[PDB]
Amino acid sequence: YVLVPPSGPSMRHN
Amino acid sequence: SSMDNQDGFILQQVKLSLDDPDSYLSSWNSNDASPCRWSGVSCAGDFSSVTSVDLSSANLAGPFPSVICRLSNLAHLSLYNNSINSTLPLNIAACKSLQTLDLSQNLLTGELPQTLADIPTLVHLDLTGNNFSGDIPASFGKFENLEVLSLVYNLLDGTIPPFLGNISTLKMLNLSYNPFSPSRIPPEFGNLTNLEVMWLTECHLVGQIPDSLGQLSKLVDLDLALNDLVGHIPPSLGGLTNVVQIELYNNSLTGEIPPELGNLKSLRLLDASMNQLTGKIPDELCRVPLESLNLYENNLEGELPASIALSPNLYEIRIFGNRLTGGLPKDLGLNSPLRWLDVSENEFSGDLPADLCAKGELEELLIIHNSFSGVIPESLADCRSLTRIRLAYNRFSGSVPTGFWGLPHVNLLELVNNSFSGEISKSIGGASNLSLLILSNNEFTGSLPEEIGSLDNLNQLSASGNKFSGSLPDSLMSLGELGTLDLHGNQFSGELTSGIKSWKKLNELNLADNEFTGKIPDEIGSLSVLNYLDLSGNMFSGKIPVSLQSLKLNQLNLSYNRLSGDLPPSLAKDMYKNSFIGNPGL
Amino acid sequence: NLEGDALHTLRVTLVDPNNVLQSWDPTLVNPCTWFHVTCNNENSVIRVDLGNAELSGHLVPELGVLKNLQYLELYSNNITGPIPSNLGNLTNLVSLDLYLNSFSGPIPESLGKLSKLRFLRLNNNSLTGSIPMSLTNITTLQVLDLSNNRLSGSVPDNGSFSLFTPISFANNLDLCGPVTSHPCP
Ligand SMILES: *[C@@H]1O[C@H](CO)[C@@H](O[C@@H]2O[C@H](CO)[C@@H](O[C@@H]3O[C@H](CO[C@H]4O[C@H](CO)[C@@H](O)[C@H](O)[C@@H]4O)[C@@H](O)[C@H](O[C@H]4O[C@H](CO)[C@@H](O)[C@H](O)[C@@H]4O)[C@@H]3O)[C@H](O)[C@H]2NC(C)=O)[C@H](O)[C@H]1NC(C)=O
Ligand SMILES: *[C@@H]1O[C@H](CO)[C@@H](O[C@@H]2O[C@H](CO)[C@@H](O[C@@H]3O[C@H](CO[C@H]4O[C@H](CO)[C@@H](O)[C@H](O)[C@@H]4O)[C@@H](O)[C@H](O)[C@@H]3O)[C@H](O)[C@H]2NC(C)=O)[C@H](O)[C@H]1NC(C)=O
Ligand SMILES: *[C@@H]1O[C@H](CO[C@@H]2O[C@@H](C)[C@@H](O)[C@@H](O)[C@@H]2O)[C@@H](O[C@@H]2O[C@H](CO)[C@@H](O)[C@H](O)[C@H]2NC(C)=O)[C@H](O)[C@H]1NC(C)=O
Ligand SMILES: *[C@@H]1O[C@H](CO)[C@@H](O[C@@H]2O[C@H](CO)[C@@H](O)[C@H](O)[C@H]2NC(C)=O)[C@H](O)[C@H]1NC(C)=O
Ligand SMILES: *[C@@H]1O[C@H](CO)[C@@H](O[C@@H]2O[C@H](CO)[C@@H](O)[C@H](O)[C@H]2NC(C)=O)[C@H](O)[C@H]1NC(C)=O
Ligand SMILES: *[C@@H]1O[C@H](CO)[C@@H](O[C@@H]2O[C@H](CO)[C@@H](O)[C@H](O)[C@H]2NC(C)=O)[C@H](O)[C@H]1NC(C)=O
Ligand SMILES: *[C@@H]1O[C@H](CO)[C@@H](O[C@@H]2O[C@H](CO)[C@@H](O)[C@H](O)[C@H]2NC(C)=O)[C@H](O)[C@H]1NC(C)=O
Ligand SMILES: *[C@@H]1O[C@H](CO)[C@@H](O[C@H]2O[C@H](CO)[C@@H](O)[C@H](O)[C@H]2NC(C)=O)[C@H](O)[C@H]1NC(C)=O
Ligand SMILES: *[C@@H]1O[C@H](CO)[C@@H](O)[C@H](O)[C@H]1NC(C)=O
Ligand SMILES: *[C@@H]1O[C@H](CO)[C@@H](O)[C@H](O)[C@H]1NC(C)=O
Ligand SMILES: *[C@@H]1O[C@H](CO)[C@@H](O)[C@H](O)[C@H]1NC(C)=O
Ligand SMILES: *[C@@H]1O[C@H](CO)[C@@H](O)[C@H](O)[C@H]1NC(C)=O
């Protein structure tokens, strides 16, 4: 099973 | 006669053609007259004709069972999450009644069969999570009733085809996560009038976003993220009447954010982060009641419009890594369930807004490398939702509110490089989840509270460059998960005790530039993971313990103390010449 | 960043029963707030401290991406497999402490390129082959322990190795030389 990243906002943070 | 069938016999042939280690097909009894009550088999009408077969997550291994196409009334087939292997056969077109075909999460390899377009009833095609390679067949432009095309997470290595714009019925185009040959977005995609989803993430897209995409009035999700798209965000995107989500992040986009984005009434999520966007964030966009606005790592300048605080749906604002100036909106968090705020690496000034955690959902407060001034809002003492607090590299002043020290779910509290004063409150004992406490380069005064030792999970205590004073609390030695203790450049006084033995996981001890007195305890040798020791600039007295020799230390400084006696044999080398300087009686 | 991506690559290949790498979140802009990672004022990793963490698995070549790394502490774990040759690309490394592990294979000749290395403790491993002559050219080397390994061949006695005692090269399979009991063919 390949986990597909859903269509949505990027998650990069400090 | 006319409406008799051998549907059960055909399904038995499917069972024979596939490996079933977990016996998912045990209910498929050759003896039963009808297959309609068999597992995964549905007959929706009279004649006991199979209309639907669903074998999702059945651990079935083998090639596509082309015999299944002899089921005349099969409209729905799902082999989702199985081990179906080999090439998809061209004789799949024999399944002429198929409306939905889901062969996702399988081991299918090779080129896509062009005969898929020769199934006229096909509405839904999902081939996600397969090993399909080569060009998308030209036949795919001729699909009669296809509403969903999903080729996500395959090995397709061709250009994005303009002929895919010729499927008038298409509602969802999902070509994401394919190693496509670098190609522009075809302007003919603008001709897909019924399109609701354009998902082209990580498709190696190049060139400008076509203005034609503005004509897609039914589009709900536009995702062109993780590509090499260049040029401006088209002002034509104001024409996307029904758009809820726009993702343009991690491209090479330049130019200003169009004010026409304000015209998008249904827009809730916009992420154009990790681009080279210039100019100011438009007021018209901020007037839209957004749930998520991410514009981080751009070249944006100017003030954040106060309109953003108007949205009752805002939970996410990540605009870090810009040159944004002025103050944050006064009413930010007052009317919205703000969960994530990151305005770090900007030129923001003035007091923090007073009501950021008004709705009690704020988890992350990240404002590092700004010119924020004044005191921490007293409201934040009651914000028990917070998990990550980074107020570092600001011009903040005043005492920290009592409650803020004791917030229950905070993992990291970083107040470094501010002018914060006052004492750490006894409320610190309530910080059950606190792992990293970093208070370095402030004006903090007073004794470390005894309740700091009640933090069993504390891993880092760094409070350097402060005016902290007094003997270390006995409880501090009880901290068995502490790896870093940095209290250098303070006014700490008193003696270390035998309790230092309990610092079993301590890697760094820096007590330098303090007023510590007494002998270095013999239990220092019991610290197996200690590699960095600085006790310099103190009044430590007596013989350096013999146990210190046993430790494998990468850094040792016992300089400028009152240590006496002969240097332990091992520590008397040329390498430790600067480790024991300024001790007269040594 | 690239440094965080490299450390996350190590996390995926290492086995972490006590979740010591729980804080290693790749979504963070840098790894400086990660526990067991220390960064400089320019936010570049200078220290990785993972000694006595009950870590298993193998190291990765991507550790070489950490240009400013000064102290690598992976000691007292059950890490297996080879010492990556890319560790020689760590120009600013001062301490390489891989001792008390199950490391196997050769001591890389690349380790000679570590000009500022002062501490090399590879002891209590299953390392095999000869001690590289390149290590003599490291002027800064002051602590060396290659003991309790399965190493063989001539022990270099020149450059930094001039002052080294037998305790450094003890309990090896077939070491020869003046520091050793048995002289060389
Ligand atoms: C082609 O490409 C499109 C675009 O990516 C795909 O589309 C979308 O599909 C995803 C996957 O289902 C959809 O995601 C989900 O939203 C559903 C509907 O939502 C709302 O209501 C819920 C429930 O109250 C709210 O929580 C939510 O905020 C919304 O207001 C949810 O029901 C789904 O939920 C589940 O998954 C999550 C995460 O695992 C769990 O935590 C939940 O418990 C739940 O099980 C999901 O979140 C998305 O809405 C679709 N978008 C559009 C625009 O259509 C297509 O699927 C894709 N097709 C193919 C064949 O590839
Ligand atoms: C995709 O389909 C898969 C079905 O083939 C789904 O996978 C399986 O998931 C279930 C539930 O999580 C697992 O069940 C558990 O089994 C263990 C004992 O297991 C193991 O032994 C079997 C023996 O045949 C072996 O195949 C496995 O590899 C394991 O070594 C129990 O202790 C648990 O209580 C539970 O019952 C299956 O084992 C697992 N099978 C396989 C082959 O992976 C998968 O979840 C589906 N994915 C999605 C996203 O829907
Ligand atoms: C396609 O798969 C079948 C069935 O095999 C299983 O599924 C594969 C994806 C793989 O995981 C195998 O290890 C599984 O056992 C393959 O067939 C069989 O071949 C093996 C010897 O290799 C034999 O012992 C079995 O009895 C065969 N079983 C059946 C049902 O044929 C088949 O070769 C695969 N084809 C391709 C092109 O990959
Ligand atoms: C996924 O597809 C690729 C590309 O077709 C496969 O790659 C090759 O494998 C085949 C099949 O044995 C070989 O005959 C070719 O020589 C390989 N070519 C290339 C360009 O790599 C790959 O094997 C497939 N993977 C799976 C898991 O099915
Ligand atoms: C664009 O879509 C149309 C409609 O699906 C395709 O149409 C037909 O062309 C074939 C082959 O020439 C004919 O047999 C059909 O009867 C046509 N159907 C209709 C409804 O006109 C057309 O092929 C597609 N064009 C491209 C370039 O893909
Ligand atoms: C963080 O705080 C420290 C301490 O106030 C700042 O450091 C000093 O830099 C000045 C020159 O600007 C020197 O004169 C001081 O002697 C330094 N002191 C110490 C203790 O290092 C540092 O510049 C601050 N800011 C940042 C961005 O790190
Ligand atoms: C330490 O001694 C060795 C052995 O004599 C020196 O050896 C070699 O160096 C030369 C020239 O530098 C190379 O051409 C040879 O390939 C090396 N031989 C071996 C056996 O490794 C080494 O240079 C000396 N190092 C120092 C710093 O004096
Ligand atoms: C490093 O390896 C050596 C050799 O394997 C370890 O050796 C010894 O200590 C044991 C104590 O339980 C004795 O039973 C062995 O006979 C003894 N052997 C030698 C050659 O000294 C040593 O403990 C290991 N070092 C550490 C720090 O664990
Ligand atoms: C839309 O289709 C027509 C006719 O097939 C074509 O000429 C036109 O170029 C298409 N639209 C775009 C924007 O290319
Ligand atoms: C951004 O894209 C680059 C490739 O251009 C990739 O290396 C990087 O990991 C991406 N990061 C994110 C957060 O999408
Ligand atoms: C502690 O913080 C971590 C990191 O944010 C979080 O994942 C975890 O759930 C928290 N645990 C408790 C007990 O609050
Ligand atoms: C120890 O500290 C003094 C000043 O506090 C410094 O000059 C000296 O270089 C330090 N020694 C080492 C070994 O770093």
Author numbering:
A (entry chain CCC): 65 to 78
B (entry chain AAA): 13 to 598
C (entry chain BBB): 27 to 211
Paper quotes:
Here we demonstrate that HSL1 binds IDA/IDL peptides with high, and CLE peptides with lower affinity, respectively. Ligand sensing capability and receptor activation of HSL1 require a SERK co-receptor kinase. Crystal structures with IDA/IDLs or with CLE9 reveal that HSL1-SERK1 complex recognizes the entire IDA/IDL signaling peptide, while only parts of CLE9 are bound to the receptor. Our work reveals that HSL1 is a receptor for IDA/IDL signaling peptides.
The vastly different binding affinities between IDA/IDLs vs. CLE9 to HSL1 prompted us to determine co-crystal structures of four HSL1-IDA/IDL-SERK1 ternary complexes with: IDA, IDL1, IDL2, and IDL3 (at 2.31 Å, 2.38 Å, 2.20 Å, and 2.70 Å, respectively) and the HSL1-CLE9-SERK1 complex at 2.87 Å. In agreement with our biochemical assays, the crystal structures revealed that all IDA/IDL peptides specifically bind to the peptide-binding surface of HSL1. IDA/IDLs adopt a fully extended conformation in the structure. The co-receptor SERK1 interacts with the C-terminal region of the different IDA/IDL peptides (residues 68-69 in IDA), completing the peptide-binding pocket using its N-terminal loop region. Superposition of the four crystal structures yielded an R.M.S.D of ~0.6 Å comparing 590 Cα atom pairs, with IDL peptides perfectly aligning to each other. Our calorimetry experiments reveal that SERK1 binds HSL1 in the presence of IDA/IDL peptides with a dissociation constant (Kd) of around 15 to 50 nM, indicating that IDA/IDLs promote a high-affinity association between HSL1 and the co-receptor SERK1. Here we report that HSL1 is a bona-fide receptor for IDA/IDL peptides that have evolved a specific binding surface for high-affinity recognition of all IDA/IDL family members.
